[PDB]
C-alpha cells in the first residue's frame, strides 16, 4: 500500500465533508487511519498530485471564525498538521500559493485560537525554502514585520505568540538588518507593562512573582514574557555575521529584568534564556561591560523562580555563571572574589546536585587562586586578607571529603549491587556463537545504617536510582580535589611573614617551605 492504492481507500470519500458535525472520519482522517507512515522514496507523487487539489478544496472553505468550539476547528487543525507531516521534493509553488491568504488575515488578533496556523505554516514554507530556493524572500517576510507593527496596538489594547525562532533566520540572510533592529528595539527597551517601574520603589530588592496583582487577566504577561524570551533568544545569531550597532548597553538591564520576571508556573523559557545568556557570554567583547551593569549581585538564586523546577536548571545556570567568572578573571577585585567563593563553596558542599557541578566548582576555585595570588602580590597591605581566603577554599575541600566519608558504608551497599548487576551482566555474554574452543575438543575427545538511604524509599521518586560505580566517583573526587589541594598548599608559600622577626640564620630555607 505504498502506491496509488490509497486513493480507492477514499475514492468514496473523495467528495467534500458535508454535515461536518458527525463526518469526522470521512476526508480529514486520510493521514490518520493507516495511510501516514508507509515508505515513499518516490512514491509520494503517485498520490501527491491528488493531495494538493483535495486539500486545496478543503482550504477554500472553513473561514476565519474561531470562537465556536470546533464545528470546523477540527478539520482546520487536521489540515494544519497534515501540512507539517508532508515532505516533498517537487511542486513547491502549488503548496505556497494556497497558504499565505490565511496568515495575511490574522495580523492583530490572537485571542481564542485566533490564527495558530502561522507558527506552523511559516515553518513549513521555511522548510520548503530550505529544500530548494523558490526566489520568494521579500513577500512572506513582511507579515511578521506587520506583526511587529501591530505589537504597539497589542500593548495598548491590554491596559500573542510571535514565535520568531526561525522566522528571521534563513541561514544565508542577504538582506538588511536595520528593520530587524527597529522591530527588536520597539519592544526590548520599553517597560513591558506600565507598572514595572513603580514596583521598583519597594526595591531597597527583587520580585519573585511577576506582578503583584496589578493586571486582571494575568495571562498576557505570561504570553508576552514568553515571546520576549523567544526574541531575546533569537537575536544572538545576528551577532556572528555582522556586528550590531545603535545600542550596546541596553541588553544587561533587560537580561536582569527578564531573569527577574520569568513566571514560576513554567520552566521551559528559562532554558533558552540561560542559553541566550551563555551565547552572549561566549563572545569576546560583550562579556566586559555586562559584569559592571549587573554589578555581579543580580546573578544569584533569584534566577530560580519557584522551587519545584529549580532543580533541572541548576547545573546549566551555575556552569554559565562560573564560565563567565572564569572568563573575566581580571575585572574582579577582592570583594567580588570573596563573594563568589562564598557561594561556590556552598555549591561544592551541596549534596543535592550532581558530581560534575561540584568538580566544576572546585575547578573554578582553583582558577581563582591565581588571581588571588596576583592581587596579593600587587599590594602587601591586604596580603593577610588574601591568605585567609586560601584557607577558606581548601577548608571546603576538607568538608567535601568529610561529606563522603560519613556515607562510607552506605556507598558499600550500592557497591554490593554493583557487583551483582555486573556479575549477572557478564555471564550472559558467553552465550556467543563463537567457536574454536568447543568444536576443537569435540573433534578431539570423540575418538579418545540507613541515613542517606531514606531518600531512596520516598513514594515520589522523581528520578531513577543510579547504577554507576560509587567507588569510581569517590576516586574521581578524591584524586581531583587532592591535586587541587597540592596546588593551593604549594601556592600558599608566597604569604609567609618576613623572617627577620624569627631572625633565622638561613632565610633561603624560608619562603619555600617554612611558614
Amino acid at each position: 500500500m505504498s502506491l496509488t492504492e490509497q486513493i480507492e481507500q477514499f475514492a468514496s470519500r473523495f467528495r467534500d465533508d458535508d454535515a461536518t458535525l458527525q463526518s469526522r472520519y470521512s476526508t480529514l482522517s486520510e493521514l490518520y487511519d493507516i495511510m501516514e507512515l508507509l515508505n515513499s522514496p518516490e512514491d509520494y507523487h503517485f498520490f501527491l498530485q491528488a493531495v494538493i487539489p483535495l486539500l486545496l478544496n478543503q482550504l477554500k472553505e472553513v473561514p476565519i471564525s474561531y470562537d465556536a468550539h470546533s464545528p470546523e476547528q477540527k478539520l482546520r487543525n487536521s489540515m494544519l498538521d497534515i501540512f507539517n507531516r508532508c515532505l516533498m521534493n517537487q511542486t513547491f509553488q502549488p503548496y505556497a500559493m494556497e497558504v499565505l491568504e490565511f496568515l495575511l488575515s490574522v495580523l492583530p488578533k490572537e485571542n481564542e485560537e485566533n490564527g495558530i496556523l502561522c507558527m506552523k505554516v511559516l515553518t513549513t514554507l521555511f522548510k520548503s525554502f530550505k529544500s530548494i530556493l523558490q526566489d520568494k524572500l521579500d513577500s512572506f517576510i513582511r507579515i511578521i514585520i506587520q506583526i511587529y507593527k501591530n505589537t504597539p496596538n497589542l500593548i495598548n489594547q491590554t491596559f500573542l505568540r510571535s514565535s520568531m525562532f526561525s522566522f528571521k533566520i534563513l541561514s544565508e540572510c542577504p538582506i538588511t538588518m536595520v528593520t530587524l533592529y527597529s522591530s527588536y528595539k520597539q519592544l526590548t527597551s520599553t517597560s513591558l507593562p506600565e507598572f514595572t517601574p513603580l514596583i521598583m520603589n519597594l526595591l531597597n530588592t527583587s520580585i519573585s512573582t511577576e506582578i503583584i496583582n496589578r493586571p486582571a487577566y494575568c495571562d498576557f504577561i505570561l504570553a508576552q514574557i514568553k515571546a520576549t524570551s523567544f526574541l531575546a533568544y533569537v537575536f544572538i545569531r545576528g551577532y556572528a555575521p555582522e556586528f550590531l550597532q545603535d545600542y550596546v548597553n541596553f541588553v544587561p538591564d533587560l537580561i536582569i529584568r527578564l531573569l527577574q520576571d520569568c513566571p514560576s508556573e513554567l520552566s521551559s523559557a528559562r532554558k533558552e534564556l540561560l542559553h541566550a545568556t551563555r551565547h552572549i557570554l561566549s563572545t569576546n567583547y560583550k562579556k566586559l561591560f555586562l559584569p559592571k551593569l549587573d554589578y555581579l549581585f543580580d546573578e544569584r538564586i533569584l534566577i530560580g523562580n519557584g522551587f519545584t523546577m529549580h532543580e533541572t536548571l541548576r547545573p546549566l545556570a551555575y556552569s554559565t555563571v562560573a564560565d563567565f567568572i572564569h572568563n573575566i578573571r581580571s575585572e574582579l577585585q577582592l570583594s567580588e572574589i570573596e563573594k563568589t567563593i562564598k557561594i561556590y563553596t556552598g555549591y561544592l558542599l551541596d549534596e543535592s546536585l550532581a558530581l560534575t557541578v561540584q568538580i566544576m566548582s572546585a575547578k573554578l576555585l582553583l582558577n581563582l587562586v591565581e588571581r588571588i595570588l596576583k592581587l596579593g602580590k600587587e599590594n602587601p597591605q591586604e596580603a593577610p586578607r588574601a591568605k585567609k581566603l586560601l584557607m577558606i577554599i581548601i577548608d571546603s575541600y576538607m568538608n567535601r571529603f568529610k561529606t563522603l566519608n560519613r556515607q562510607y558504608d552506605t556507598i558499600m551497599k550500592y557497591y554490593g549491587r554493583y557487583e551483582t548487576h555486573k556479575k549477572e551482566k557478564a555471564e550472559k555474554l558467553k552465550n556467543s556463537i563463537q567457536d574454536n574452543d568447543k568444536e576443537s575438543e569435540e573433534f578431539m575427545r570423540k575418538v579418545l545504617v540507613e541515613m542517606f538511604d531514606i531518600k531512596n524509599y520516598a513514594p515520589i521518586l522523581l528520578l531513577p536510582t543510579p547504577t554507576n560505580d560509587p567507588i569510581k566517583d569517590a576516586f574521581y573526587l578524591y584524586r581531583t580535589l587532592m591535586s587541587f589541594l597540592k596546588t593551593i598548599i604549594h601556592d600558599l608559600k608566597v604569604f609567609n611573614p618576613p623572617p627577620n622577626e624569627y631572625t633565622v640564620a638561613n632565610p633561603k630555607l624560608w619562603a619555600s617551605v617554612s611558614r
Binding site: 519557584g306 560519613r406 556467543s432 567457536d435 540507613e450 513514594p459 515520589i460
Partner: protein, 623 residues
C-alpha cells in the same frame, strides 16, 4: 569574643563528664543570644564576614547544644527552638551533626513513644507560621523521614495506628488537608519555596501507598487534596499529582469516567523532565485499567487511545515514550496488528545515534508476540532492518539470536557490497553463519553453491597481508558449508569447491616467507580434516614443512618467554600448532616424512614449552 565564649564553655563541659550545668540549660540560652547578637553585629556593620573561626565556633556551639538536647527530659521544645535559632542565617542543617540527632530521634517501633509526641508538636510546627519555609522544609525532612522509615523497615503503618488508637496528629492533618481550597492560598499568600506543596504531596503519597484500608473516613479529603494539584501550571508537581492519584485509583475507590481522563492526560504532552514520573504512573495505572475496562466486554478503547496519540505525534522524539510503553508490559497486547507495522517503521526510522538499545527492545517485543501465538511484507522489512543493523557496525548478539529464532518461523544474496571493510567482513561472516544454517534445513545447501562460492572467494583468500579475524570468523560458516553429506550420491558440485579449497591450501602453503600465509592452510586443512576423513594425503609434506617452520620460529620465541607487544600473534601460533599436531598426527600413512616429523616432535619435548599441549602430545603418544 564569640569563639572565646564558645571554647571556654566547651572546655568547662569537657573537663567534667556531663554538663557543668547538670542539664540546667541557662548558659546555653545565653550562648544562643550571644550567637544572635554577633550575627546581627556582623550583618549590620560590614567589616569582615564568613570566616574560618566563625564556622568552627558555630560547629562547636551546635555540638554542645545537641549534646545537651540528647541529655534532657524535655527534648521536644529546644530542638524546634534550635530550628528557630538559624531561621535568618547559619546553614540549612548541621550535616551529620543535627541530622544524626534526628536519626537518633527515629527510634525503632516508638517503644518509648517520645517520637509520636515529637510528630505531634512537629506538625504543630508545620501548620503554625512561626518560622520561614526553610525550617518547615527541615520539618518535612524529619516527619516524612520517620514516616517512610516506619513504612520501610517495619510494617506499613502497623505500629502507630492499630484500631484508631492514638492518631493524635491525623486530625491536625485533616485541618491541614481541608485548607487546600482556593489553591491553598498559593496566589493570595506568597511562598517562594515550592518544597512545601511537594512535601504535602509526598505526605499524601505516604498515606496512600502505605495503608489505605485501615482508614476510610479520610479518603474524600485525600482525593480532593490530590486532585486540586492537577489544576496547576507547573510540570513536575502536575505529574507527581498524576502519580499519586494513579496510586489511589490503583489501590481502591475506582471511578468510571475520570480514570480514562487521567490515562489520556498521562499519555499526552509529556516532555523530557517528567519521563520517569509518567513511567511509574503508567506502570501502576494500567494493570487495573485493563482488568476494570474488561469488566464489560466491548469497551477496549484504551488501545485506541494509545493508537490515536501514537499517530498524533508521528515520527517525533516524544513517540519513544509510547514505544517503550508497549514494551514494559506485553501480556496486554497481541490483540492488535497495526502496532507491528508502526514499531517496524519506528525502528527503521530511529536506527539512523544512541537509541539503538530502544529498537532492539522493539524487535524483542515482536518475537514475544510470535511465541505468544504458540504479516508478510513486514517480515522481510524487519529482517532487512536486522541484517542492516548488524552489518552497520552486547546487543548485536541479541540481534543475532533474535534473527536466528525469527528465520525459522532478505533471503537473497545481498552481501556482495560487504579500514572498516574487515569489520564489515567479520559482521558479514557472523551473519552468514546462521543465515545459511537456518534455511533449507534438511542439509540442502547445494543449489546456491556457485553464488555463495563467488561470495566467499573474496574472503577465503583473505589472510595474505591482513588480520587473522576474517579467517577465524569465516571458519564456522565454512565448517557449516562443507558438510553436505559428502559427494557419493549427488552430482559433483561440492567436489569442485573441495578441489578449489585444497589447491588454495596448497598455494598458500607454498608461501612460507611470512607468518600470514601459514595460517590459512592449516585452518582450511583442519576444517577439511574435521568435516572429511579424506584430505590432501599426497600433499602432506607441506604440512610437515610448515610444522618445521613453526618449530624453527618457536626457536625464535624460545629464549623469550613472552612478547612485549603483539602477544596474541604468538599464542595463536601455539594454537595452530596444537591444530597441526593432531592434523599431521592422526594419519600415520606417511612415507619418508615420518622420521623428520618425529625428530621435530622430540625437539618439541626437548625445549621449554607450555604444559597444556605437552599433555596433548602425551595423550597423542598414548593413542
Amino acid at each position: 569574643f564569640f569563639t572565646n565564649m564558645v571554647d571556654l564553655f566547651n572546655t568547662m563541659v569537657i573537663t567534667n563528664g556531663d554538663e557543668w550545668l547538670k542539664k540546667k540549660g541557662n548558659m546555653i540560652l545565653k550562648l544562643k543570644d550571644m550567637l544572635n547578637l554577633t550575627l546581627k553585629t556582623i550583618k549590620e556593620n560590614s567589616f569582615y564576614i564568613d570566616h574560618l573561626q566563625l564556622n568552627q565556633s558555630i560547629a562547636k556551639f551546635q555540638a554542645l547544644y545537641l549534646r545537651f538536647t540528647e541529655l534532657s527530659e524535655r527534648d521536644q521544645n529546644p530542638l524546634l527552638l534550635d530550628f528557630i535559632d538559624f531561621s535568618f542565617s547559619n546553614g540549612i542543617k548541621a550535616s551529620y551533626s543535627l541530622k544524626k540527632f534526628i536519626f537518633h530521634n527515629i527510634i525503632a517501633s516508638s517503644n518509648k513513644e517520645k517520637q509520636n509526641n515529637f510528630i505531634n508538636d512537629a506538625t504543630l510546627f508545620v501548620l503554625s507560621d512561626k518560622c520561614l519555609d526553610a525550617r518547615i522544609f527541615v520539618l518535612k525532612n524529619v516527619i516524612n523521614s520517620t514516616l517512610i522509615y516506619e513504612v520501610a523497615t517495619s510494617g506499613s503503618l502497623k505500629s502507630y495506628l492499630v484500631e484508631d488508637k492514638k492518631p493524635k496528629w491525623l486530625e491536625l492533618l485533616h485541618n491541614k488537608i481541608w485548607k487546600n481550597s482556593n489553591a491553598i492560598l498559593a496566589y493570595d499568600v506568597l511562598d517562594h519555596h515550592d518544597l512545601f506543596r511537594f512535601e504535602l504531596l509526598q505526605l499524601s503519597a505516604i498515606f496512600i501507598k502505605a495503608d489505605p484500608e485501615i482508614i476510610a473516613e479520610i479518603k474524600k479529603d485525600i482525593i480532593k487534596f490530590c486532585w486540586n494539584f492537577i489544576k496547576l501550571e507547573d510540570t513536575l508537581i502536575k505529574q507527581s499529582a498524576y502519580l499519586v492519584t494513579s496510586y489511589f485509583i490503583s489501590k481502591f475507590d475506582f471511578p468510571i469516567k475520570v480514570v480514562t481522563q487521567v490515562f489520556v492526560a498521562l499519555l499526552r504532552s509529556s516532555h523530557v523532565e517528567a519521563r520517569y514520573l509518567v513511567k511509574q504512573s503508567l506502570d501502576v495505572l494500567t494493570p487495573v485499567l485493563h482488568e476494570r475496562m474488561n469488566a464489560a466486554g466491548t469497551p477496549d478503547t484504551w488501545i485506541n487511545w494509545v493508537k490515536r496519540v501514537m499517530v498524533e505525534n508521528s515520527s517525533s522524539q516524544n513517540n519513544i515514550l509510547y514505544q517503550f510503553l508497549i514494551s514494559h508490559p506485553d501480556l496486554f497486547f497481541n490483540s492488535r496488528d497495526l502496532f507491528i507495522s508502526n514499531i517496524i517503521h519506528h525502528m527503521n526510522k530511529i536506527t539512523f545515534s544512541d537509541s539503538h538499545t530502544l529498537a532492539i527492545d522493539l524487535a524483542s517485543l515482536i518475537l514475544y508476540w510470535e511465541n505468544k501465538t504458540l504479516s508478510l511484507h513486514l517480515r522481510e522489512a524487519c529482517t532487512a532492518f536486522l541484517i542492516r543493523y548488524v552489518c552497520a557496525s552486547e546487543l548485536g548478539l541479541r540481534a543475532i539470536n533474535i534473527l536466528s529464532e525469527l528465520i525459522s518461523d532478505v533471503k537473497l544474496v545481498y552481501f556482495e557490497k560487504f579500514s572498516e571493510n574487515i569489520l564489515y567482513y567479520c559482521m558479514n561472516a557472523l551473519d552468514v553463519l546462521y543465515v545459511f544454517f537456518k534455511n533449507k534445513t534438511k542439509e540442502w545447501i547445494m543449489e546456491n553453491l556457485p553464488t555463495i562460492q563467488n561470495l566467499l572467494e573474496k574472503c577465503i583468500k583473505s589472510d595474505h597481508h591482513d588480520v587473522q579475524e576474517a579467517l577465524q570468523k569465516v571458519l564456522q560458516v565454512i565448517m557449516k558449508a562443507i558438510k553436505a553429506q559428502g559427494v557419493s550420491v549427488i552430482i559433483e558440485e561440492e567436489s569442485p569447491g573441495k578441489t578449489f579449497i585444497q589447491m588454495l591450501t596448497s598455494v598458500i602453503t607454498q608461501d612460507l616467507q611470512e607468518t600470514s600465509s601459514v595460517t590459512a592452510g592449516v585452518t582450511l586443512a583442519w576444517v577439511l580434516f574435521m568435516n572429511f576423513p579424506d584430505n590432501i594425503v599426497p600433499l602432506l609434506t607441506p604440512l610437515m614443512k610448515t610444522f618445521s617452520k613453526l618449530c624453527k620460529d618457536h626457536l625464535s620465541i624460545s629464549q623469550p618467554k613472552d612478547a612485549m607487544a603483539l602477544e596474541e600473534a604468538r599464542i595463536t601460533t601455539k594454537l595452530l600448532e596444537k591444530v597441526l599436531y593432531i592434523l599431521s598426527l592422526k594419519v600415520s600413512l606417511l612415507g619418508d616424512s615420518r622420521r623428520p616429523f618425529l625428530s621435530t616432535v622430540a625437539l618439541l619435548i626437548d625445549h621449554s614449552m607450555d604444559q597444556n599441549f605437552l599433555r596433548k602430545i602425551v595423550n597423542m603418544s598414548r593413542s
